């Protein structure tokens, strides 16, 4: 089985970004959830892009960016235990937000 | 030593609901999750449910789905649960345990707590 | 929904002889390396104890005369010498998926 793409949102505080995604079921305690999390700008793409990782978290604060600039993000999740892993889900639909000028 | 403290007996009458608690000890709260289980009267025992006292996160066992919510306050360390619309057959014993990750299960009991539903 | 299954649901078994418990689940258990089948002891009037894990670990505390073994749905848990500590009711239950659940209990008692 397989886990459906994740649920991706973007905030912002001032001036400082994040992004935020849910699943759908709560992870189980004896298994970790590994998500890869991807975002770039209007410019460049995916492909172009690094896709760091990280594990059973919901949220990923965001580096300085660019004023006045369209970006993106994905996400996906894999169900990972002891070293074995599972099925990359689809990607997260991509969602996008314009940079405060 | 893990403790699981939980609160006293209680005696209910049908219709309402009832709202135990446990509270936790003995290790980083947030590190584990709190699970519950009715152990009903001269039988084996039923899982209701499980919550991350990290995020709050929750997984109910279906039974038990709209009968039992789980909830968590941090700065106390204490898992309290809620069951509404009693009747006679909820009478039973709950406890609430504590989790691992290594095996995922049931490491550490509470001494349980004893909710009668009559009139 | 794996549903778990203890025979028998009850034995009498002599001091210092063995004791063999047997829980099989209506589907496999196993998955990501482990066998998710862990077993209790509770004794009356006393919350569940860890007794197993992850199928063959013996919880912090338990005595050498505990031992468990199985993989994919047949497990056994074995007491050997069986003591009067014993005399109580095990549990099996399962963690491969959600719901969690529980065996029937099997209920030993000491004899003398």
């Known amino acids: 089985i397989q886990m459906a793409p994740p649920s991706l949102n973007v905030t912002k505080d001032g001036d400082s970004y994040s992004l935020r995604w849910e699943t759908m079921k709560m992870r189980y305690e004896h298994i970790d959830h590994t998500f890869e999390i991807q975002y770039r700008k209007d410019t460049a793409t995916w492909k172009d892009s690094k896709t760091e990782t990280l594990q059973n978290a919901h949220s990923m604060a965001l580096p300085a960016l660019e004023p006045s600039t369209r970006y993106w993000a994905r996400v996906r999740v894999r169900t990972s235990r002891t070293g074995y892993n599972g099925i990359w889900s689809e990607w997260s639909e991509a969602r996008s937000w314009d940079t405060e000028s | 030593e893990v403790q699981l403290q939980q609160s006293g007996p209680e005696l209910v009458k049908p219709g309402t609901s009832v709202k135990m608690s446990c509270k936790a000890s003995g290790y980083t709260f947030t590190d584990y999750y709190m699970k519950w289980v009715k152990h009903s009267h001269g039988k084996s025992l039923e899982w209701i449910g499980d919550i991350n006292p990290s995020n709050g996160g929750t997984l109910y066992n279906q039974k038990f789905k709209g009968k039992a919510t789980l909830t968590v306050d941090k700065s106390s360390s204490t898992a309290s649960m809620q069951l509404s619309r009693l009747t006679s057959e909820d009478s039973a014993v709950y406890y609430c345990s504590r989790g691992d990750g290594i095996h995922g299960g049931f490491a550490y009991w509470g001494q349980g707590t004893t909710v009668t539903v009559s009139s | 929904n794996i549903v778990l299954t203890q025979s028998p649901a009850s034995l009498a078994v002599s001091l210092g002889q063995r004791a063999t418990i047997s829980c099989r689940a209506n589907?496999?258990?196993?998955?990501?390396?482990?066998?998710?089948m862990h077993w209790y002891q509770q004794k009356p009037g006393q919350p569940p104890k860890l007794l197993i894990y992850?199928?063959?670990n013996l919880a912090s505390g338990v005595p050498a005369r505990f031992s468990g073994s199985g993989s994919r749905t047949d497990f056994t848990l074995t007491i050997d010498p069986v003591e009067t500590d014993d005399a109580a009711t095990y549990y099996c239950?399962?963690?491969?998926?959600?719901?969690?659940?529980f065996g029937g209990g099997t209920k030993l008692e000491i004899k003398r």
């Open positions: 239950q399962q963690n491969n998926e959600d719901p969690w659940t």
């Open positions: 589907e496999s258990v196993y998955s990501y390396g482990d066998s998710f």
């Open positions: 992850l199928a063959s």
